[PDB]
């Protein structure tokens, strides 16, 4: 097998910028260079962008430029859009095909405060002796937030897990869920439930609560 070396592994970039990413091959690819470029959007299911190094696929923009030859190859985006947020892979096809490790292209953008929603446990779930309280942080940037739970002013720990979305394909923002897990028992003993959120795009911490 031919080792395919791609770089950089990751790229943070404002929508205006021009970006270029390299892919070197331990061996030459010429018979036509049998180099291809693929794009994978947040899954999705990768699409082929460029073949024989530089010829783009059907319906693919003029912003995507493939170049280089034999051993060193380049992929260029001229004015990256938010929608270009994806990971890009190169594939040599000269031998038994192999992919580079890929370049994650992350979109940079301006700081955006989260809108914060809280969700009490559903009656249905409580009849199972468990209680999930959910705190949602919608559409923010950066990634990249502290979420703290308070029950009856009592700070919590070890009782929550967070899940972060992939960056949004149209506005480049994140969303986050925080989930407090309790037993029906611990839950019913208490009245006030709060998440307190601190974030770069926030003058002072925001707390949602029921």
């Amino acid at each position: 097998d031919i080792v395919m070396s791609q770089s950089p592994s990751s790229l943070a970039v404002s929508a205006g910028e021009k970006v270029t990413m390299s892919c070197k091959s331990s061996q030459s690819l010429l018979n036509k260079n049998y180099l291809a470029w693929y794009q994978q959007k947040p899954g999705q299911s990768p699409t082929k962008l460029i073949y024989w190094a530089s010829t783009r696929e059907s319906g693919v923009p003029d912003r995507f430029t493939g170049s280089g030859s034999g051993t060193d190859f380049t992929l260029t985006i001229s004015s990256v859009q938010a929608e270009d947020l994806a990971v890009y892979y190169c594939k040599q096809s000269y031998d038994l095909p192999t992919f580079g490790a890929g370049t994650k292209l992350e979109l940079k953008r301006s700081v955006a405060a989260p809108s914060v929603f809280i969700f009490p446990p559903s009656d249905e779930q409580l009849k199972s002796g468990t209680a999930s309280v959910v705190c949602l942080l919608n559409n923010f940037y950066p990634r990249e937030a502290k979420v703290q739970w308070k029950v009856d002013n009592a700070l919590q720990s070890g009782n929550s897990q967070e899940s972060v979305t992939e960056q949004d394909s149209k506005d480049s923002t994140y969303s986050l869920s925080s989930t407090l897990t309790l037993s029906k028992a611990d839950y019913e003993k208490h009245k006030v439930y709060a998440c307190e959120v601190t974030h770069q795009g926030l003058s002072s911490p925001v707390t949602k609560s029921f």
Binding site: Y38, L96, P120, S122, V164
Partner: protein, 208 residues
Amino acid sequence: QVQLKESGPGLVAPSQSLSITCTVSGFSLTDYGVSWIRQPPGKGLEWLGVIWGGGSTYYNSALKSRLSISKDNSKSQVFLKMNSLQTDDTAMYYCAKPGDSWGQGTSVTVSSASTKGPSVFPLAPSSGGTAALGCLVKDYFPEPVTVSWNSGALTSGVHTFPAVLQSSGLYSLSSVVTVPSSSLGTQTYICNVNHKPSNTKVDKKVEP
């Protein structure tokens, strides 16, 4: 136009055998090669093999011995068979056809544990200018789900979070949609949650 559809188990025991088929429409397999690519979670793409027109099969050096690709032109089908699966073999498996279109992919988890369907609980909306609601998909295994709203119809404002591991070792996630508070009374919101590997289909009325 060409489409490729993979089908396979979702969960398999270590050391056992994996079978995935790719059913293809919109082109003939005497005319095209179908290749197989896998992607382990958080990792890159790995090329497994290909079968050409009169195939004639090539494999990935490293896995060559564990692997068989065959096809059936008549049935419009390609098979991937893999044996002695380890947990390393946990991947999304794709099939693929100037090129060149891919199937959706099939998630494949190698674990000795057994299947469990999800419980679905509604994240109900309450008391600026817009409101969120959602569904909670708790303790299931393996990946994935596969959540939608109004059986397709609703797709904007929707976020579906990546599955997280519970200390139970089961996965859970939430799917939230944002809407305007105005719409809450007149508009009705149902989330349709599918978990292929356990044959579970669930729909949930999400009321304020």
